[PDB]
Design a protein around this ligand. Sequence first.
Ligand code: HEC
Length: 80
Amino acid sequence: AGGGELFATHCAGCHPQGGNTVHPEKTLARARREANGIRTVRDVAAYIRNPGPGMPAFGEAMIPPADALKIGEYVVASFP
Ligand code: HEC
């Protein structure tokens, strides 16, 4: 699913079935994404850039921001 092909390689290895392999308390569930407030496409492009501890990072070396706005979508076809 375009963005899925990317998320299923640069995320799949940590975000298996909208799950987590590091933190079993921080899922992609809106219920949670709401508390922190992460229910947007952009948000799912910037942070990824320079996110906090626990999660790696993704510069414009491999995946360009413009290509990130495409990923944010993948996270809007299951649990916006
Ligand atoms: C393990 C090496 C990870 C990879 C690869 C990716 N993410 Fe991640 N993600 C990870 C953790 C441990 C957490 C919990 C938050 C923390 O305190 O670290 C998360 C959380 C998210 C969330 C939910 C909250 C948020 O900050 O957005 C989202 C939406 C998210 N992660 C997105 C995401 C994407 C799009 C990734 C591939 C580009 C990706 N993550 C990789 C661990 C890991």
